[PDB]
Amino acid sequence: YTRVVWCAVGPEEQKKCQQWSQQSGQNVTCATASTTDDCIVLVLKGEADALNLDGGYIYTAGKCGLVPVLAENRKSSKHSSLDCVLRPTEGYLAVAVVKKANEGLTWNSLKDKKSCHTAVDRTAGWNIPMGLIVNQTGSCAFDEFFSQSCAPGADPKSRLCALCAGDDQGLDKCVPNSKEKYYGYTGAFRCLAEDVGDVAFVKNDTVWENTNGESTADWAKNLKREDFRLLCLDGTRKPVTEAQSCHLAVAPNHAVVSRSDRAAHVEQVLLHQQALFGKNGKNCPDKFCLFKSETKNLLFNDNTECLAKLGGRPTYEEYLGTEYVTAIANLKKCSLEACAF
Numbered sequence: 001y002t003r004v005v006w007c008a009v010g011p012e013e014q015k016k017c018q019q020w021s022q023q024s025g026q027n028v029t030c031a032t033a034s035t036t037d038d039c040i041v042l043v044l045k046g047e048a049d050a051l052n053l054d055g056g057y058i059y060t061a062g063k064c065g066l067v068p069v070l071a072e073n074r075k076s077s078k079h080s081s082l083d084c085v086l087r088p089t090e091g092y093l094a095v096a097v098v099k100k101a102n103e104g105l106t107w108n109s110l111k112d113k114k115s116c117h118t119a120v121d122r123t124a125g126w127n128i129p130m131g132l133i134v135n136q137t138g139s140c141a142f143d144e145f146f147s148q149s150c151a152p153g154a155d156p157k158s159r160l161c162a163l164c165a166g167d168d169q170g171l172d173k174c175v176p177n178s179k180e181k182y183y184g185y186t187g188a189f190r191c192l193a194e195d196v197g198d199v200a201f202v203k204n205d206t207v208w209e210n211t212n213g214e215s216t217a218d219w220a221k222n223l224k225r226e227d228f229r230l231l232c233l234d235g236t237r238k239p240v241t242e243a244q245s246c247h248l249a250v251a252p253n254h255a256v257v258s259r260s261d262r263a264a265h266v267e268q269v270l271l272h273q274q275a276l277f278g279k280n281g282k283n284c285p286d287k288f289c290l291f292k293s294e295t296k297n298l299l300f301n302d303n304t305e306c307l308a309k310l311g312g313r314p315t316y317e318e319y320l321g322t323e324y325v326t327a328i329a330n331l332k333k334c335s336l337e338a339c340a341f
């Protein structure tokens with residue numbers, strides 16, 4: 001009923017979910033899975049109700065009948081008067097980041113280099129860059145393009161996982177959850193920051209949130225914006241201040257999905273949960289903040305201002321957009337009446 005079971009990916013998200021559960025009086029409860037895909041499955045079975053997903057998984061989930069309910073909304077500049085929950089979503093910029101000291105490394109010389117991806121199947125870390133690379137190469141062997149990488153979710157024995165490090169014990173190497181050191185936006189960027197990889201496929205925001213004192217995490221403490229460069233599709237290199245003219249694409253924001261028969265109810269519970277634990281929430285920062293977790297982006301991205309209502313009750317195809325939807329279809333022809341489970 002007004003009770004919602006959230007699906008947590010990995011033990012760290014489980015921990016944050018439990019706090020949220022404790023503070024919600026149990027209006028929100030938790031289920032945990034090792035992978036986002038397993039979480040998709042728990043929702044289909046009806047053992048969990050919702051979770052926040054990157055666009056790539058929204059695509060997987062959509063083919064299986066799950067729908068967009070509310071989307072992450074971060075601070076903008078245009079469309080000022082509108083409240084956050086009513087304001088349109090902008091989408092983030094997918095970028096390719098390199099070290100400035102690594103001269104002569106451009107989009108046109110990425111072959112045989114070392115890469116850092118958020119996870120297999122994600123928008124900025126995989127779908128966009130690999131779709132572009134397959135497109136340009138005219139060959140479905142994206143697994144041979146880079147010499148070594150860390151792409152959580154690929155075969156641990158393959159070169160796509162050679163750069164991944166697992167947890168502090170060396171266990172769970174390449175798993176697509178935060179236990180993997182170089183998982184997600186922050187992980188992929190850390191992979192580049194520590195010179196494990198030559199390039200990182202992350203979003204524009206990740207660079208800003210983890211440099212010039214914004215992080216304080218020990219690996220990011222001393223990172224400086226000028227030491228990084230974005231790779232543009234025209235073979236050029238630009239400062240990270242130029243993301244508007246040097247991105248690989250703009251991605252649809254992450255969004256909360258659920259089985260359609262449960263959407264209306266998940267929507268009403270969440271809107272109330274954010275009134276309590278959101279940005280200007282009754283109990284944040286006092287008791288619990290839904291959008292905080294110190295640069296780890298647990299359950300939701302840390303830069304989320306609020307969860308917004310979607311305009312025009314969009315299907316997953318409309319929400320992702322035709323442009324992005326055909327990009328994925330074309331890449332998956334390498335790896336359509338579907339649903340993977």
Ligand SMILES: *[C@@H]1O[C@H](CO)[C@@H](O[C@@H]2O[C@H](CO)[C@@H](O[C@H]3O[C@H](CO)[C@@H](O[C@@H]4O[C@H](CO)[C@@H](O)[C@H](O)[C@@H]4O)[C@H](O)[C@@H]3O)[C@H](O)[C@H]2NC(C)=O)[C@H](O)[C@H]1NC(C)=O
Pocket residue numbers: 075076077093204205206208209214242243244303
């Ligand atoms: C690439 O991604 C970066 C990071 O997301 C984008 O830069 C961000 O732009 C925001 C708006 O477009 C900036 O937020 C506004 O609101 C706050 C409050 O008014 C301003 O100051 C903040 O103060 C708090 C202190 O409590 C700090 O937490 C913030 O760091 C900031 O100092 C801010 O000046 C601005 O008016 C936001 O600050 C900014 N983020 C950072 C880390 O600088 C960037 O636009 C984007 N590029 C493109 C092309 O999209």
Ligand SMILES: *[C@@H]1O[C@H](CO)[C@@H](O[C@@H]2O[C@H](CO)[C@@H](O[C@@H]3O[C@H](CO)[C@@H](O)[C@H](O)[C@@H]3O)[C@H](O)[C@H]2NC(C)=O)[C@H](O)[C@H]1NC(C)=O
Pocket residue numbers: 127128131132135322323326327330
């Ligand atoms: C990989 O290559 C494929 C195939 O060339 C790319 O797909 C193509 O994408 C374009 C742009 O999305 C599609 O064109 C669009 O057509 C509509 C209809 O007129 C129009 O409104 C848009 O303005 C645009 O012109 C095109 O149909 C599609 N081609 C095929 C065969 O699917 C794909 O984008 C490439 N991958 C990446 C990541 O770019």
Ligand SMILES: OC[C@H]1O[C@@H](OC[C@H]2O[C@H](OC[C@@]3(O)O[C@H](CO)[C@@H](O)[C@@H]3O)[C@H](O)[C@@H](O)[C@@H]2O)[C@H](O)[C@@H](O)[C@H]1O
Pocket residue numbers: 071087088089090091092250251252253254310311312318319320321324
């Ligand atoms: O979530 C962010 C992404 O949304 C994707 O689909 C959802 C979103 O986008 C549509 O598109 C373009 C446009 O209307 O959005 C803004 C302001 O929101 C503009 O810049 C545009 O005019 C749709 O019409 C929206 O209602 C919806 O919220 C989309 O594929 C991505 O581009 C990105 O916006």
Ligand SMILES: *[C@@H]1O[C@H](CO)[C@@H](O)[C@H](O)[C@H]1NC(C)=O
Pocket residue numbers: 002023024025027276
């Ligand atoms: C839990 O749900 C009830 C039913 O709407 C609501 O009245 C109450 O405020 C909620 N409590 C918390 C802590 O969210």
Ligand SMILES: [Fe+3]
Pocket residue numbers: 054055122123124251254
């Ligand atoms: Fe993403």
Ligand SMILES: [Zn+2]
Pocket residue numbers: 247249250
């Ligand atoms: Zn563009």
Ligand SMILES: [Zn+2]
Pocket residue numbers: 312313314315318
């Ligand atoms: Zn529609």
